[PDB]
Each structure stands twice: as C-alpha cells, then as structure tokens.
DNA sequence: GGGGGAAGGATTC
DNA sequence: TTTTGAATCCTTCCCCC
Ligand SMILES: Nc1nc2c(ncn2[C@H]2C[C@H](O)[C@@H](COP(=O)(O)OP(=O)(O)OP(=O)(O)O)O2)c(=O)[nH]1
Ligand SMILES: [Ca+2]
Ligand SMILES: [Mg+2]
C-alpha cells in the first residue's frame with residue numbers, strides 16, 4: 001500500500017496572506033486573543049518568517065511581541081480558514097476515493113490503485129501540489145510511504161513547500177535511527193516515559209518485555225509502537241466523522257459563583273449549537289478549566305437528542321455537580337456535545 | 342473475567 | 355501576566371452480567 005499525505009504549510013497564516021498578499025515576506029502571527037487584558041492570549045500559528053525568530057504556536061502574544069514588536073498580528077478566523085480548507089479537500093477527492101481528513105490541514109490519500117511505485121506516486125504528489133497552488137494559491141507539503149505514520153513523517157521532514165518519499169529500505173533505517181519522540185502520537189509526557197526505558201528509538205521497543213512497556217505507556221501505545229517497530233503497521237485510510245462539537249471560553253476573571261459563570265456557559269452553548277448545525281447530540285458535557293489549569297468535567301447522556309433548552313438546563317446542573325465536587329476556582333468554562341443521532 | 346459507559350489524561354491540531 | 359482553544363483516542367474506575 002502506498003500512502004500520500006498532504007499537510008498545508010503554515011495554513012492559518014498562509015490563508016491570511018492569500019487574502020492580503022501585501023503580507024507576503026513580512027512575519028505574520030495569527031493570534032487567539034483571550035480578552036482578560038491587553039494582548040492576553042497565545043499564538044495560533046505564525047508563517048515561517050516569524051518562526052525564524054522564536055515566534056511559534058503556543059507562546060503568549062505578549063512574549064511574541066517582545067521578540068517581533070513590528071510583526072503583523074492578526075486575530076484567528078477559523079470560519080474562513082475552514083472554508084478554504086473544505087475547498088482544498090474537495091480538490092484532493094479527485095486523486096483518490098479513499099481519503100482521510102485528519103485535521104483542518106491534513107488528509108491521507110490511499111493511492112494504491114492509482115500508481116505503482118514511488119516514482120509514479122512522487123509525480124502525483126507534484127500534480128497535487130500544483131493543482132492546489134493553482135486553484136487556491138496555497139503551498140503544501142506531501143509525504144509518501146507504505147503506511148500513514150511514515151507518510152506523515154515524510155511530510156514532517158520536507159515541509160514547508162516540500163515533497164518526500166520514504167521507501168521500504170528507509171522505513172527500516174528510521175525504525176532504527178529516527179528519534180522515537182519524533183513519531184506521530186508520541187507527545188512529551190510519553191516521550192519521557194520512553195526516552196527513559198532506554199527506548200529512544202522505535203526498534204528498542206522490540207527488546208523490552210512487553211508488560212514493562214505496557215505498564216508504562218499503556219497497552220494501546222505499546223502495541224502501536226511495537227507494530228511500527230516490526231513494520232506491520234497498516235491502518236486503513238478510513239473516513240473520519242466528527243464525533244463531538246464544543247466550545248470553551250475564558251472568563252473575564254476566575255470564579256466559582258454560579259450566576260457569574262452562567263453567561264459564559266450559555267454563550268458556549270449558543271455557539272456550540274450554531275456549530276452543531278442539524279446534528280442532534282444525545283450527550284452533553286460541561287468542561288471547566290480551573291485556575292491551576294486542570295480540567296474537570298461532568299456529563300450526561302439522554303436516550304434522546306438534546307434540545308437547546310435542555311442543554312441550558314442540564315448544563316447548569318452539571319456546572320453545579322462540578323462546583324460541588326471541586327473547590328478550586330474556575331478560569332475556563334465551556335461545553336461539549338456528542339453521540340449524534 | 343470482561344463488556345460498556347463516565348471522568349481524567351494526553352496528544353495534537 | 356503564560357496560557358488558547360478544540361477534539362480525539364488512551365487509560366482508569368466503577369457498575370453489572
Ligand atoms: N487555535 C489553535 N490552533 C493551532 C495551534 N497550534 C496549531 N494550530 C492550528 C493551525 C494549523 O492549521 C494546524 C497546525 O498544524 P501543526 O501543529 O501540525 O503545525 P503545522 O506546521 O502543520 O501547521 P501550521 O500551519 O504551521 O500552524 O493547527 C494552537 O495552539 N491553537
Ligand atoms: Ca500544516
Ligand atoms: Mg496540521
């Protein structure tokens with residue numbers, strides 16, 4: 001099986017450039033302003049010019065500004081980015097029937113049945129990069145290999161505006177040399193539990209006792225890593241159906257005073273429902289992020305779809321179940337809906 | 342012993 | 355004054371046959 005992965009380059013920042021070309025060349029930083037105070041919030045993403053100087057996703061807007069005080073700072077426009085993405089995705093649907101839309105800027109194409117070797121694949125990759133750059137003037141990076149995991153790793157090494165293939169021989173090379181932390185699905189917390197069992201490479205996972213690994217990272221991660229080490233990872237490019245829609249917002253100030261919180265929670269529901277658009281959820285979860293940034297959540301499932309009026313009522317019941325079973329103040333309150341009919 | 346759903350956990354977009 | 359926000363798939367817990 002041959003996999004072709006497409007990962008839009010610095011997408012949010014790039015889509016902004018596409019709507020205001022004058023931005024090209026200058027460092028652009030797309031922000032998520034929180035509103036607690038002047039320039040509060042974090043950076044959603046920055047084009048490469050900005051990244052060169054330490055301005056990247058996650059860093060507070062404040063700091064980003066100390067580094068590049070004269071950069072173009074723009075407020076995130078998800079809706080807009082979403083629509084461009086949809087279009088770009090529909091372009092990809094013309095290179096394969098089997099397409100997996102991982103995120104707003106990532107899709108996997110099963111091009112086994114469309115090409116035969118990595119040369120023919122690699123060409124289709126360029127044909128794809130072009131079609132997109134033509135129809136939407138957006139640069140992307142393509143990853144090609146035997147499975148989704150290594151396809152993605154290709155793209156990771158190539159971006160931006162790149163394209164790379166990882167043949168069966170190199171997959172084996174990487175199984176030995178690639179830093180296990182640079183494997184899709186292995187975040188910091190898990191990297192540590194590993195880049196700690198002497199497991200700093202994929203291959204290493206085959207030499208340790210299974211149970212030891214399982215006990216540390218979990219049965220699922222353990223099997224995931226093992227299978228990759230053995231070169232038997234072949235997940236199918238399946239269609240992902242969104243399974244939950246929600247919205248969580250930052251309050252002007254921390255609190256555990258029910259009335260004071262109600263407005264924010266209702267705004268979250270309002271927006272949540274607008275986003276649900278026709279989808280009917282039989283499950284609701286009130287999510288709270290405390291002052292010390294921990295996550296607390298209570299939810300209920302109904303044998304029927306939830307009406308917005310119901311959402312409102314039950315949410316308050318859940319927010320109360322939170323306030324009662326926790327004594328920490330709350331900083332962020334939101335809601336999340338699932339189990340669509 | 343294990344199916345199955347609630348709450349926290351972590352990853353990553 | 356971090357610190358943002360959305361959605362997932364994983365583990366862990368208790369209920370129940
Ligand atoms: N709201 C929000 N969006 C983020 C954040 N980090 C990344 N994103 C969004 C922007 C991108 O479209 C998508 C990014 O994907 P990745 O983290 O793989 O980085 P990549 O370099 O592919 O994306 P980029 O376009 O560079 O931001 O997720 C964040 O902290 N907050
Ligand atoms: Ca990207
Ligand atoms: Mg991405």
Ligand SMILES: [Mg+2]
Pocket residue numbers: 181182183186187188191
């Ligand atoms: Mg990692």
